[PDB]
Design a protein around this ligand. Sequence first.
Ligand SMILES: Nc1ncnc2c1ncn2[C@H]1C[C@H](O)[C@@H](COP(=O)(O)OP(=O)(O)OP(=O)(O)O)O1
Ligand SMILES: [Ca+2]
Ligand code: NA
Length: 430
Amino acid sequence: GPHMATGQDRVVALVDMDCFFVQVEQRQNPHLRNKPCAVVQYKSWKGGGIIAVSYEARAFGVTRSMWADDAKKLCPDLLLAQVRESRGKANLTKYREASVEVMEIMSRFAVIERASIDEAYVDLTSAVQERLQKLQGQPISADLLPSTYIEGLPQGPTVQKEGMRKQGLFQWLDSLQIDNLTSPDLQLTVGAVIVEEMRAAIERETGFQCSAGISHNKVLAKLACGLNKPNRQTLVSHGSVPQLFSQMPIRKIRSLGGKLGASVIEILGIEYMGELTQFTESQLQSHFGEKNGSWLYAMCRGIEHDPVKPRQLPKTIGCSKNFPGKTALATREQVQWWLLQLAQELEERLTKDRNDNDRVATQLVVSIRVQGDKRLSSLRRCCALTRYDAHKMSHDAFTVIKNCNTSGIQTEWSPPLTMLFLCATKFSAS
DNA sequence: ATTATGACGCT
DNA sequence: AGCGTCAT
Ligand SMILES: Nc1ncnc2c1ncn2[C@H]1C[C@H](O)[C@@H](COP(=O)(O)OP(=O)(O)OP(=O)(O)O)O1
Ligand SMILES: [Ca+2]
Ligand code: NA
């Protein structure tokens, strides 16, 4: 009853760029705009691997992970942009730099949590309170929400997409209590008005379009964001949760896409998020552990407490390369040359990072994969990172891995290595 | 022969 | 510390 928390204490948004690497390439090369197009890395092996796909190309069935030669079978006029290659490896600098452009804009509106190269969570609780004071009980016009969907509406007693959207928006606004400054639904709505403003500023200042979700926590905001992509934003209210979750496959909720979600399904014999409500908190803790159990019990009711962490910069800076099949590194000289290639890219990114962000990394993590292991990483060792110098870092990386060499011969490397990875971590202010 | 990242939980 | 999970 009156003591039952409803998880309506915050307004949180998740903003995610549409087909991000594709938009970066389309901005740069206008010939790619408004066309079926994809971004690919490498090219020699089956035309390159696809990492991003424009919405026009998705209509033909083109997807991430697909080889470009295969994508062309579905979409013969597919256009391609290639990721930059430097020092013999893919270099993602252009996209990291485009990401900073977007993140700096978002940061004008509120504190953000950088969730990936093209996604940030925003805690808007404070900004909403403020805007509510300016409004002074004044109603919110649909004109302030020109790209917003209200999940679950319209409902109750036109056949076009935009007409539906407006009908739902109208029902939502018609029902709002604008007189109550602490109404969660009102707070969400003001949140959405602010996100429209953030999304317009992003598009104006960078050319990039995005989608967004607005709800009371990160998981719902993330789920909401995906409901109406591209170039749209979706509000998911606390009230919309029972119907939304009633047919929502468990794997769709962030963190349940893998083995834990599979076990929730198998152990409990259910399919949808809403079905979770029938288990006690202790039942769920008994199957999935204390932390997961509590999290599930609240989450299936639309409640989650994970904070938007104040962090705009990545916590680690890493460089990795696979050496598949026949290309696996089998000689000491090969291993040393590639460690250097990786180490040079890392030095370049670290030096830039130190000048930009007033910090220095203090630990170097080195990770390899050996031919045969099903696991992505086979071994991980750390050493001190005391100077930003590529030759030193590559020398140290070798030292910590060289005893992995099974070969009795000095010059040979066995088993051959199928992945090398260098990562700078443990930053300190400077 | 997906590849290149990046955050966080467990012991 | 080193490994695993989950994500983009
Ligand atoms: N598995 C991956 N391997 C390499 N790069 C990836 C991978 N997944 C995503 N990326 C890169 C390319 C994407 O443009 C960018 C953002 O990813 P993501 O948000 O999942 O898709 P997207 O932005 O391309 O399309 P969407 O409009 O569906 O969000 O990160
Ligand atoms: Ca995206
Ligand atoms: Na994303």
